[PDB]
């Protein structure tokens, strides 16, 4: 038999990490870490969505489960081509998290007539499901 220690696997803060902004002028747009300052502050730079290069406090940003290759202290021009090189937008967009974000946005934007349609369709689905529970 082997040792069998557990792990406590973590999302790290390092050069090349990609992050989602909580609150601010950007708020909800993706960014990428360039270089670290100390425990709490770091230097982000999202070249694509519409977010300036800035030092930001780690209390105002959330870490994702995704990292891309980047040299330390790279300029926006390099980071822009590196982000597009990373193919990270479609990878973020393909995931569950972003889908769940996209859903609660779609539920918000829903005219009174459609919320009715939904009700007419879910009643209609309910019937087909509860027959399957009745059979097996």
């Amino acid at each position: 038999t082997d040792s069998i220690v557990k792990a406590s696997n973590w999302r790290l803060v390092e050069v090349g990490r990609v992050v989602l902004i909580k609150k601010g002028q950007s708020a909800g747009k993706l960014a990428a870490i360039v270089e670290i300052i100390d425990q709490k502050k770091v230097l982000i730079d999202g070249p694509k969505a519409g977010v300036p290069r800035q030092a930001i406090n780690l209390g105002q940003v959330v870490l994702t489960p995704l990292t891309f290759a980047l040299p330390r202290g790279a300029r926006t021009a390099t980071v822009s081509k590196k982000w597009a090189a990373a193919a990270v937008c479609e990878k973020w967009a393909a995931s569950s998290w972003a889908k769940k974000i996209a859903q609660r946005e779609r539920r918000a934007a829903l005219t009174d007539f459609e919320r009715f349609q939904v009700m007419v369709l879910r009643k209609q689905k309910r019937y087909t499901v509860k027959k399957a529970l009745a059979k097996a």
Partner: protein, 172 residues
């Protein structure tokens, strides 16, 4: 005191018939505005030369923006300050993106660690350290190591609702 800026100030006594064209003295102040910056100048010219705001005049008061706003640096700040007992000198070590930010931490830090107020401190010289291995302190040097990674254990989640239905996890 406040969210700081950096200013340049220049002044030169008043002119006279016996001696036209005086000498022009200059300084670099950290303040929230111009009105406090002009005052600090006359405070520091009174500590050196035989002058006051009655005898003197300001020539040009100019803001100094940062040269590379989004580049990480290692500053070395000297400082003179009053304790309850005596009046000492120091050399703290700060790491930030701009000079004005390093001064904004230094004032906040001297207040925590020593109970030194704004009134009791003179920033002698903020100087950017160009080369690596010119860093005497330890708490800046830890971050200068190669391939630096570190986790953030124990994540919390500020809620809007008073009650919650699930029971929370502190994973990251």
């Amino acid at each position: 005191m406040a969210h700081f800026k950096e200013y340049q100030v220049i002044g030169r006594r008043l002119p006279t018939e016996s001696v036209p064209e005086p000498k022009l003295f200059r300084m670099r102040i950290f303040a929230s505005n111009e009105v406090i910056a002009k005052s600090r100048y006359w405070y520091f010219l009174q500590k050196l030369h035989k002058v006051k705001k009655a005898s003197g005049e300001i020539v040009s008061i100019n803001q100094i923006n940062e040269a590379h706003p989004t580049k990480v640096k290692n500053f070395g700040v000297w400082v003179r300050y009053d304790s309850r007992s005596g009046t000492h000198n120091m050399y703290k070590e700060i790491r930030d993106v701009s000079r004005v930010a390093a001064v904004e931490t230094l004032y906040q830090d001297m207040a925590a660690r020593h109970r030194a107020r704004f009134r009791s401190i003179h920033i002698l010289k903020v100087a950017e350290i160009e080369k690596t291995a010119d860093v005497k302190r330890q708490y800046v040097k830890q971050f200068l190591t190669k391939d630096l990674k570190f986790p953030l254990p124990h994540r919390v989640q500020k809620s809007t609702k008073t009650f919650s239905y699930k029971r929370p996890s502190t994973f990251y």
